PDB file of C-alpha atoms and ligand atoms in Angstrom:
ATOM      1  CA  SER A 447     -23.375  15.073  17.267  1.00  0.00           C
ATOM      2  CA  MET A 448     -26.789  13.419  18.172  1.00  0.00           C
ATOM      3  CA  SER A 449     -29.388  14.252  15.096  1.00  0.00           C
ATOM      4  CA  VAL A 450     -26.599  16.843  13.757  1.00  0.00           C
ATOM      5  CA  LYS A 451     -25.295  15.600  10.422  1.00  0.00           C
ATOM      6  CA  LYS A 452     -22.161  16.858   8.636  1.00  0.00           C
ATOM      7  CA  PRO A 453     -22.646  16.689   5.008  1.00  0.00           C
ATOM      8  CA  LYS A 454     -21.023  13.583   3.887  1.00  0.00           C
ATOM      9  CA  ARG A 455     -18.722  12.749   1.078  1.00  0.00           C
ATOM     10  CA  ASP A 456     -19.994  10.670  -1.834  1.00  0.00           C
ATOM     11  CA  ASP A 457     -18.182   7.470  -1.212  1.00  0.00           C
ATOM     12  CA  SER A 458     -19.829   5.111  -3.462  1.00  0.00           C
ATOM     13  CA  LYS A 459     -17.125   4.796  -5.995  1.00  0.00           C
ATOM     14  CA  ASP A 460     -14.581   4.490  -3.423  1.00  0.00           C
ATOM     15  CA  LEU A 461     -14.313   0.529  -4.097  1.00  0.00           C
ATOM     16  CA  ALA A 462     -13.709   0.996  -7.425  1.00  0.00           C
ATOM     17  CA  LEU A 463     -11.267   3.886  -7.384  1.00  0.00           C
ATOM     18  CA  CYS A 464      -8.821   1.910  -5.061  1.00  0.00           C
ATOM     19  CA  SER A 465      -9.017  -1.045  -7.065  1.00  0.00           C
ATOM     20  CA  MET A 466      -7.735   1.005 -10.193  1.00  0.00           C
ATOM     21  CA  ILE A 467      -5.031   2.457  -8.250  1.00  0.00           C
ATOM     22  CA  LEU A 468      -3.932  -1.068  -6.581  1.00  0.00           C
ATOM     23  CA  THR A 469      -3.778  -2.263 -10.451  1.00  0.00           C
ATOM     24  CA  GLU A 470      -1.739   0.808 -11.692  1.00  0.00           C
ATOM     25  CA  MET A 471       0.332  -0.033  -8.700  1.00  0.00           C
ATOM     26  CA  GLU A 472       0.568  -3.758  -9.405  1.00  0.00           C
ATOM     27  CA  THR A 473       1.821  -2.598 -12.875  1.00  0.00           C
ATOM     28  CA  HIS A 474       4.378  -0.762 -12.459  1.00  0.00           C
ATOM     29  CA  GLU A 475       7.728  -2.042 -13.240  1.00  0.00           C
ATOM     30  CA  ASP A 476       9.128  -0.879  -9.853  1.00  0.00           C
ATOM     31  CA  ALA A 477       6.559  -2.886  -7.847  1.00  0.00           C
ATOM     32  CA  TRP A 478       8.361  -6.416  -8.118  1.00  0.00           C
ATOM     33  CA  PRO A 479       9.697  -6.288  -4.508  1.00  0.00           C
ATOM     34  CA  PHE A 480       5.967  -5.860  -3.343  1.00  0.00           C
ATOM     35  CA  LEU A 481       3.893  -8.431  -5.363  1.00  0.00           C
ATOM     36  CA  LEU A 482       4.205 -11.084  -3.006  1.00  0.00           C
ATOM     37  CA  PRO A 483       4.716 -11.205   1.006  1.00  0.00           C
ATOM     38  CA  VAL A 484       8.398 -11.455   1.837  1.00  0.00           C
ATOM     39  CA  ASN A 485       8.937 -14.851   2.585  1.00  0.00           C
ATOM     40  CA  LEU A 486       9.609 -15.153   6.332  1.00  0.00           C
ATOM     41  CA  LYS A 487      11.584 -18.310   6.233  1.00  0.00           C
ATOM     42  CA  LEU A 488      14.076 -17.435   3.607  1.00  0.00           C
ATOM     43  CA  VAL A 489      14.753 -13.652   4.588  1.00  0.00           C
ATOM     44  CA  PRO A 490      16.800 -13.322   7.815  1.00  0.00           C
ATOM     45  CA  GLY A 491      15.506 -10.975   9.968  1.00  0.00           C
ATOM     46  CA  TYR A 492      12.272 -10.080   8.611  1.00  0.00           C
ATOM     47  CA  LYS A 493       9.835 -12.216  11.056  1.00  0.00           C
ATOM     48  CA  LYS A 494      11.223 -10.344  14.080  1.00  0.00           C
ATOM     49  CA  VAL A 495      11.873  -6.614  12.556  1.00  0.00           C
ATOM     50  CA  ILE A 496       8.871  -6.176  10.969  1.00  0.00           C
ATOM     51  CA  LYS A 497       5.700  -6.478  13.204  1.00  0.00           C
ATOM     52  CA  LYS A 498       2.960  -6.219  10.596  1.00  0.00           C
ATOM     53  CA  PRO A 499       4.296  -7.326   7.007  1.00  0.00           C
ATOM     54  CA  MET A 500       1.956  -6.421   4.060  1.00  0.00           C
ATOM     55  CA  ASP A 501       2.247  -6.418   0.309  1.00  0.00           C
ATOM     56  CA  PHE A 502       0.329  -5.534  -2.693  1.00  0.00           C
ATOM     57  CA  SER A 503      -1.475  -9.290  -3.051  1.00  0.00           C
ATOM     58  CA  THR A 504      -2.478  -9.168   0.570  1.00  0.00           C
ATOM     59  CA  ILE A 505      -3.979  -5.675  -0.060  1.00  0.00           C
ATOM     60  CA  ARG A 506      -5.845  -7.095  -3.323  1.00  0.00           C
ATOM     61  CA  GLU A 507      -7.166 -10.125  -1.097  1.00  0.00           C
ATOM     62  CA  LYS A 508      -8.574  -7.586   1.361  1.00  0.00           C
ATOM     63  CA  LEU A 509     -10.002  -5.390  -0.907  1.00  0.00           C
ATOM     64  CA  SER A 510     -11.644  -8.139  -2.970  1.00  0.00           C
ATOM     65  CA  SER A 511     -13.604  -9.574  -0.161  1.00  0.00           C
ATOM     66  CA  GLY A 512     -14.689  -6.601   2.083  1.00  0.00           C
ATOM     67  CA  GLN A 513     -11.895  -6.322   4.729  1.00  0.00           C
ATOM     68  CA  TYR A 514     -11.547  -2.438   4.335  1.00  0.00           C
ATOM     69  CA  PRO A 515     -14.007  -0.591   5.866  1.00  0.00           C
ATOM     70  CA  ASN A 516     -13.443   2.510   4.423  1.00  0.00           C
ATOM     71  CA  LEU A 517     -10.916   4.076   2.079  1.00  0.00           C
ATOM     72  CA  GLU A 518      -8.687   5.468   4.610  1.00  0.00           C
ATOM     73  CA  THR A 519      -8.154   1.946   6.216  1.00  0.00           C
ATOM     74  CA  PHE A 520      -6.672   1.047   2.614  1.00  0.00           C
ATOM     75  CA  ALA A 521      -4.246   3.645   1.887  1.00  0.00           C
ATOM     76  CA  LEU A 522      -3.036   2.932   5.675  1.00  0.00           C
ATOM     77  CA  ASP A 523      -1.931  -0.626   4.296  1.00  0.00           C
ATOM     78  CA  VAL A 524      -0.398   0.595   1.340  1.00  0.00           C
ATOM     79  CA  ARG A 525       1.700   3.120   3.355  1.00  0.00           C
ATOM     80  CA  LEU A 526       2.568   0.035   5.497  1.00  0.00           C
ATOM     81  CA  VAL A 527       4.088  -1.644   2.440  1.00  0.00           C
ATOM     82  CA  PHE A 528       6.599   1.125   2.193  1.00  0.00           C
ATOM     83  CA  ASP A 529       6.904   2.045   5.540  1.00  0.00           C
ATOM     84  CA  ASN A 530       7.973  -1.565   6.066  1.00  0.00           C
ATOM     85  CA  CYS A 531      10.376  -1.028   2.987  1.00  0.00           C
ATOM     86  CA  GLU A 532      12.114   1.792   4.301  1.00  0.00           C
ATOM     87  CA  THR A 533      12.705  -0.248   7.879  1.00  0.00           C
ATOM     88  CA  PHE A 534      14.504  -2.879   6.394  1.00  0.00           C
ATOM     89  CA  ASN A 535      16.432  -1.757   2.989  1.00  0.00           C
ATOM     90  CA  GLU A 536      19.122   0.845   2.585  1.00  0.00           C
ATOM     91  CA  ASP A 537      17.701   4.025   0.982  1.00  0.00           C
ATOM     92  CA  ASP A 538      20.597   3.390  -1.587  1.00  0.00           C
ATOM     93  CA  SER A 539      19.718  -0.195  -2.827  1.00  0.00           C
ATOM     94  CA  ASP A 540      17.281  -1.612  -5.747  1.00  0.00           C
ATOM     95  CA  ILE A 541      14.704  -2.454  -3.485  1.00  0.00           C
ATOM     96  CA  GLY A 542      14.982   0.725  -0.914  1.00  0.00           C
ATOM     97  CA  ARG A 543      15.021   3.060  -4.367  1.00  0.00           C
ATOM     98  CA  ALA A 544      11.994   0.972  -5.915  1.00  0.00           C
ATOM     99  CA  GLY A 545      10.146   1.848  -2.347  1.00  0.00           C
ATOM    100  CA  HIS A 546      10.598   5.336  -2.615  1.00  0.00           C
ATOM    101  CA  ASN A 547       9.650   5.315  -6.484  1.00  0.00           C
ATOM    102  CA  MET A 548       6.055   3.442  -5.613  1.00  0.00           C
ATOM    103  CA  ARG A 549       5.534   5.752  -2.638  1.00  0.00           C
ATOM    104  CA  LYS A 550       5.557   8.898  -4.594  1.00  0.00           C
ATOM    105  CA  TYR A 551       3.861   7.185  -7.226  1.00  0.00           C
ATOM    106  CA  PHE A 552       0.830   6.328  -5.101  1.00  0.00           C
ATOM    107  CA  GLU A 553       0.802   9.256  -3.033  1.00  0.00           C
ATOM    108  CA  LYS A 554       0.020  11.584  -6.232  1.00  0.00           C
ATOM    109  CA  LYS A 555      -2.804   9.272  -7.563  1.00  0.00           C
ATOM    110  CA  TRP A 556      -4.288   9.415  -4.057  1.00  0.00           C
ATOM    111  CA  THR A 557      -4.230  13.041  -4.369  1.00  0.00           C
ATOM    112  CA  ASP A 558      -5.670  13.194  -7.989  1.00  0.00           C
ATOM    113  CA  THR A 559      -8.265  10.531  -7.180  1.00  0.00           C
ATOM    114  CA  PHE A 560      -9.760  11.943  -3.940  1.00  0.00           C
ATOM    115  CA  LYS A 561      -8.528  15.480  -3.788  1.00  0.00           C
TER     116      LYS A 561
HETATM  117  C1  TYZ B1906      10.003  -5.886   0.384  1.00  0.00           C
HETATM  118  C2  TYZ B1906      11.281  -6.461   0.636  1.00  0.00           C
HETATM  119  O1  TYZ B1906      12.050  -5.782   1.588  1.00  0.00           O
HETATM  120  N1  TYZ B1906      11.739  -7.604   0.298  1.00  0.00           N
HETATM  121  C3  TYZ B1906      13.088  -7.849   0.346  1.00  0.00           C
HETATM  122  C4  TYZ B1906      13.057  -9.481  -0.055  1.00  0.00           C
HETATM  123  C5  TYZ B1906      14.597  -9.575   0.229  1.00  0.00           C
HETATM  124  C6  TYZ B1906      15.652  -8.926   0.615  1.00  0.00           C
HETATM  125  C7  TYZ B1906      17.085  -9.811   0.516  1.00  0.00           C
HETATM  126  O2  TYZ B1906      17.126 -11.234   0.258  1.00  0.00           O
HETATM  127  O3  TYZ B1906      18.106  -9.023   0.906  1.00  0.00           O
HETATM  128  C8  TYZ B1906      15.613  -7.898   1.187  1.00  0.00           C
HETATM  129  C9  TYZ B1906      14.104  -7.257   1.210  1.00  0.00           C
END
C-alpha cells in the first residue's frame, strides 16, 4: 500500500529473455503453422470463430516496438496462439499436434527462464 513496497523482482533482462524464447520458438520445426497470421480471406471460418488472432510474427513486431508492458502480457499472447490453435484444429491433425508440442516447449522455457 502507500509507502509500503514489496521487494521488486529484477525485471531488467526480461525483454532480452523473452526475445530469446521467441527466437527458439520461431526456429522450432513445428512452428510453421504459427509463423504468420492465418489468412482470413482464404481460411473458411477463421475470422468469425477466432476473436483475437495471434501469431509469432505479430508477437515479434510487438516485442520489437515496446508494445508489451511486462513479461506477463508477452506470455498471454504466446498462449493465445496455442489456445486459438486448439479452438480451431482437431487434436489429431498435424496443426493440432504442432500446437500441443509448441505449448509444451514454450511452458518449459518459461519456467526455466523465470522460475
Ligand atoms: C494456426 C492455424 O490454425 N492455421 C490453419 C491454417 C490453415 C488451415 C486449413 O486450411 O485447414 C487450418 C488451420
